Amino acid sequence: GSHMGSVGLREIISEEDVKQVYSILKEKDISVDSTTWNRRYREYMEKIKTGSVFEIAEVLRDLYLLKGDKDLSFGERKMLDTARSLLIKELSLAKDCSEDEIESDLKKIFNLA
């Protein structure tokens, strides 16, 4: 049984995956190249609809480190606005609080504040 698609799951997860997801974005050396960024926008744009939880978190993360700052540009904010509403949605399980738990934790992950 071979397949080179998505990880398998969608968004329905528990605190188990949440701990793993944070570990994916915990690294700061993931900063994508500018020449490749133009094409990365395309793949990541589909990850918002077809991409799994482990992918959504990588998407918004790349966009955050691509700017190297907190208040992202209008261009990154366009796709990030969607990936944000999905970031806290899956992680909501382990959040056990307001959206600020994950939304503000971005500063601790991407080192913004």
Which amino acid would we find at residue 57? A
Cα distances (Å, whole numbers) of residue 25 to 41, 55, 65, 74, 107: 17, 10, 10, 22, 11
* Pairwise CA distance, residues 92 & 102, whole Å: 8
Identify how the structure was determined: NMR
88 vs 6: CA distance, rounded Å: 20
Which is nearest to 63 in space by CA: 85, 41, 94, 46?
Answer: 41
Token pair 């904010």 is found at 77
Domains and CATH numbers, the chain: 12-111 (1.20.58.1290)
CA 59 to chain centre: 4
